[PDB]
């Protein structure tokens, strides 16, 4: 009920998981250092296969919002503009 | 586009960020098209598995879109996909210890900037 899986959105499930984990980090409901649920504990929480959560947790690792602390997932601690620049550009070019 | 083989950043992420740079820096732009998965996988010395992933990373982020069998810089605005990307921008901003006063102060600074 914290992470809403939107089954008819066209955002892939793993990406809605990741997006919402970022929102929760943004909202501060997940402070830094906060260990995350297991891949298995979160999949079952959501009704989802571990693979989709795996993909979600890895997306968050490459993007730099969580980190692995000997095989457990933890919110990191530090430091999207190019994203803005491309949509203004896409905006004004209309 | 150059692949730093020794960096800890993943290859697909390297490719993606560099292309995003081109889209952002105007050097790549709405309606433009990108090399085939294989053309790029052959320009670079990289197998097509991680090139495919790079492209599908740009698709999910919202940057490009398959049009015929072609990966194409997104041109379409006013839709809901437009609005999602914004939310991601402010959401990722807030999640990097930025004020809300801060972020939108800096949003205006980039809109004005490129109306060049």
Residue numbers in the entry:
A (entry chain A): 3 to 81, 85 to 99
B (entry chain B): 5 to 120
List sentences from the manuscript.
The thermoacidophilic model crenarchaeote Sulfolobus acidocaldarius is predicted to harbor a gene encoding a putative GntR-type TF belonging to the YtrA subfamily. Closer inspection of the amino acid sequence encoded by the concerned gene (Saci_1851) learned that the C-terminal E-O domain of this 121-amino acid protein consists of about 50 amino acids predicted to fold into two α-helices, thus classifying it as a member of the YtrA subfamily. YtrASa performs an (auto-)repression function by interacting with high specificity and affinity with a 32-bp long inverted repeat. YtrASa represses the transcription of an operon encoding its own gene and a membrane protein and of a second gene encoding a membrane protein by interacting with a binding site that fully covers the transcription initiation site.
A crystallographic analysis of YtrASa yielded a structure at 3.0 Å resolution. The 14-kDa YtrASa protein crystallized as a dimer with the asymmetric unit of the crystal structure containing a homodimer with an exclusive α-helical structure. Each monomeric unit displays an N-terminal DNA-binding domain harboring the typical GntR-like wHTH motif (α1–α3) and a short C-terminal E-O domain, consisting of two α helices (α4–α5) that mediate dimerization, which is a typical feature for YtrA-like regulators. Upon comparing the YtrASa structure with that of the only described bacterial YtrA-type crystal structure, CGL2947 of C. glutamicum, major structural differences are observed despite the similar topological organization. The distance between the two monomeric Arg42 residues, located in wHTH domain, amounts 36 Å, which is similar to the length of one turn of the DNA helix. This is only about half of the distance between corresponding monomeric residues in the C. glutamicum YtrA structure. For one of the YtrASa chains, the α5 helix could not be modeled due to poor electron density, likely explained by a flexible behavior of these C-terminal helices within the crystal. Furthermore, the alignment of individual monomeric chains from within the same dimer demonstrated that the E-O domain has an asymmetric nature. Although these observations might be ascribed to the crystal packing and are not necessarily biologically relevant, the short length of α4 underlies a compact E-O domain regardless of its exact conformation and a shorter distance between the two monomeric DNA-binding domains in comparison to other YtrA-like regulators.
